[PDB]
Amino acid sequence: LGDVELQKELNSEYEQLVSDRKFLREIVFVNGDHNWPLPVNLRRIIQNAQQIFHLDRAKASDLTIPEIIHGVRDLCKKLFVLRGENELIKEAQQNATSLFQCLVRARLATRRILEEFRLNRDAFEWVLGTIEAQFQRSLVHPGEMV
Amino acid sequence: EDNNRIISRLWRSFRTVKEMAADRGYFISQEEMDQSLEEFRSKICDSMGNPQRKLMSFLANPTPEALEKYSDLGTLWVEFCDEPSVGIKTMRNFCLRIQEKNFSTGIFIYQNNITPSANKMIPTVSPAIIETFQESDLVVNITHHELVPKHIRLSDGEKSQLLQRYKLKESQLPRIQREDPVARYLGLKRGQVVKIIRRSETSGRYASYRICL
Amino acid sequence: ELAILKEERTTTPYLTKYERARILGTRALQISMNAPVLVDIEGETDPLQIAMKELSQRKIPLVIRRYLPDGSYEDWGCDELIVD
Amino acid sequence: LIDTAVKTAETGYIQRRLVKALEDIMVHYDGTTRNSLGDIIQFLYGED
Amino acid sequence: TPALTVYLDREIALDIEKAKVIQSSIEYTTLKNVTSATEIYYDPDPTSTVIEEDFDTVEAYFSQSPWLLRLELDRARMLDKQLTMNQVADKISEVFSDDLFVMWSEDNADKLIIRCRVIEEDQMLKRIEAHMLDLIALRGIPGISKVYMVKHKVSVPDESGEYKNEELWALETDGINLAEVMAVPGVDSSRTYSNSFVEILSVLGIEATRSSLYKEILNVIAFDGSYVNYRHMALLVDVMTSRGYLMAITRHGINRADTGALMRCSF
């Protein structure tokens, strides 16, 4: 409580979420439909993490706030569809995963990670690794006669 | 009465032409773009209410940003033709006017039709470029439609960078015909590429490229 | 000329299902024609099984030549591509 | 019975023309979707 | 079944009376649509008439060829369509200038009558009568034979931000003329849609055709409850639009490609 420096991150988090909601509601999904086909189902991944590490408990969590905000933001740069450093590729890579990044950020929000899913340090790092691994596995394979 | 619908459609066509000029990179003053219909009737109609097309012509220059991006952008001359049927007589004075005042591009709005004989006088006036539009087709600015995403012409440097990234010959990109409504609106010439950023229900945002024949 | 240098390789670092199937079959075929096998063979003596065992230990001595649309290509060894 | 017997050949012809239109379209290693001429049909398959 | 979906501006869409005004201006009405009967008399005296029925009509009104063209308008269809004798005669004036004297009876009369005279011609009047019924346009947009008043349930966010339903009036037509209907005041010119994508290509360009093509295919598949993932229908419409024009999936489209002869001859 009172920490203005930690409040600057959480403000930037909420500002990011406001951009997404405004972008998606006014440009992408005008009619308000919010259920859509998307890759790697985060709801199932989280409830598996709750089982492996027995994430019942009121045992206060040792998972600090800067680990959450920086963890999620760093994840969205490792969802490689196209590799290469060319400026056009990075724009294309960012465009390809725009909708999916919004989906992740909408779930791995600070309050939900701590109040609802109740992840600890061991489980949260595992969740990030699994999302990263399963997204790669969901890319179409070159050679596919689509 | 019926005179009001003539003025109204013509006034709407005028706002569309200004929008067209703005999107191509030319500078249009923020007072002329927002000019209301009432001010327009006062300046253009006679005492009998009939409009004088020759008072509507105007000249525009590129913005500094557009000149930075496209170094081939010169002066644009927009003209509304007072003669409903454009014959051999009208076209000669128009081509002469463009050359004498050395405009880079001229936009020719006609009223009813253009005879096929007069249509051959259009590519004989190069390196100046003449484009024609029927007044009906400009009453609505089609780029404001939901189904038409924003087209942005790529510069020559951006185009070359694009072809190398995909290791493409020019003839391998998807195409858009020259007489397509959005290509004509931008005054696209052969070899130029538009970039098209488009809504997508699976990824949110997607950039499509097309090259103009 | 056409070959792309190792530091500038851009295609995906995961073995695709199509590359996997071709590698297993080709290596299986070579073993049935009595090519030297690079792993210990215990109880599993089928040609396909031995080839699948070599794959799991990253010991298949083959290189994928992945052709790109313009005709250029990146050579990737099966020793360095990550298999799920 | 007439409908099932008649319209089965209508849709059978539909599927034949669709396959020949699309048979040569392949995903390449740069992510583009191209036909046998190397024409780009989509810059990225399915836009995702 | 060519059809337009004509969304209206918001202020008009929630007021049924204003929407009806838009309806009558779009709908095509010819002279033939409102005419019940035509007649050809021999009326030799230009200042009088042998017809006892039009006696009091023409005698009080007045205070060239002997052949008279007398056409009768149906009161019911004229009343429903909201057309006056004056405005019907106005449209006739512009196209028939000084070759025809037009005289109309009053709306209070028992029969609604319009008299015409020219100022060998027995057949010329039959040819002119054919020419009249086939070309005189009283109002409206050509090609729009019927206009339906359709209610749309569109989901729009509240001021509170919660998604709520909202009923709005729109129009749908039989027949198409996308360019002309877009320009009509009252019509939301940024959203009008047509189920003929051939016409869309001429009016809106190739990228709009892509979305319209997808919408029409999806509607067909989704109708019997089926669902096909987006990427498959998306793939088909990109093939159909890559050349910049619509390539049909027939021999006339497919085999006009620069593909090899062995491949093309197998179809």
mmCIF file of C-alpha atoms in Angstrom, chain B residues 165-166 168 171-174 198 200 202-203 206-209, chain D residues 30 32 34 37-48:
data_model
loop_
_atom_site.group_PDB
_atom_site.id
_atom_site.type_symbol
_atom_site.label_atom_id
_atom_site.label_comp_id
_atom_site.label_asym_id
_atom_site.label_seq_id
_atom_site.Cartn_x
_atom_site.Cartn_y
_atom_site.Cartn_z
ATOM 1 C CA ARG B 165 11.870 -9.987 -47.947
ATOM 2 C CA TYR B 166 9.654 -12.430 -49.853
ATOM 3 C CA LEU B 168 9.441 -12.147 -55.215
ATOM 4 C CA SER B 171 4.444 -10.538 -61.368
ATOM 5 C CA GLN B 172 3.789 -12.808 -58.377
ATOM 6 C CA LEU B 173 1.821 -10.412 -56.185
ATOM 7 C CA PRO B 174 -2.001 -10.322 -56.228
ATOM 8 C CA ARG B 198 -7.789 -5.268 -42.904
ATOM 9 C CA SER B 200 -9.595 -10.294 -39.411
ATOM 10 C CA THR B 202 -8.885 -14.876 -36.446
ATOM 11 C CA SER B 203 -5.887 -12.579 -35.906
ATOM 12 C CA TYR B 206 -3.766 -8.456 -41.183
ATOM 13 C CA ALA B 207 -1.741 -6.621 -43.843
ATOM 14 C CA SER B 208 -2.506 -7.543 -47.461
ATOM 15 C CA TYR B 209 -0.495 -6.224 -50.420
ATOM 16 C CA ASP D 30 8.268 -18.632 -45.407
ATOM 17 C CA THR D 32 3.209 -17.709 -47.549
ATOM 18 C CA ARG D 34 1.241 -20.150 -52.980
ATOM 19 C CA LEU D 37 3.405 -20.660 -60.254
ATOM 20 C CA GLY D 38 4.611 -19.095 -57.037
ATOM 21 C CA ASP D 39 1.773 -16.590 -57.056
ATOM 22 C CA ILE D 40 0.990 -15.427 -53.524
ATOM 23 C CA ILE D 41 -2.579 -16.236 -52.566
ATOM 24 C CA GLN D 42 -2.217 -15.262 -48.884
ATOM 25 C CA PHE D 43 0.840 -13.747 -47.244
ATOM 26 C CA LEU D 44 0.201 -15.880 -44.163
ATOM 27 C CA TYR D 45 -2.012 -18.972 -44.079
ATOM 28 C CA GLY D 46 -5.409 -18.366 -42.519
ATOM 29 C CA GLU D 47 -4.093 -14.934 -41.451
ATOM 30 C CA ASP D 48 -2.811 -16.607 -38.248
#
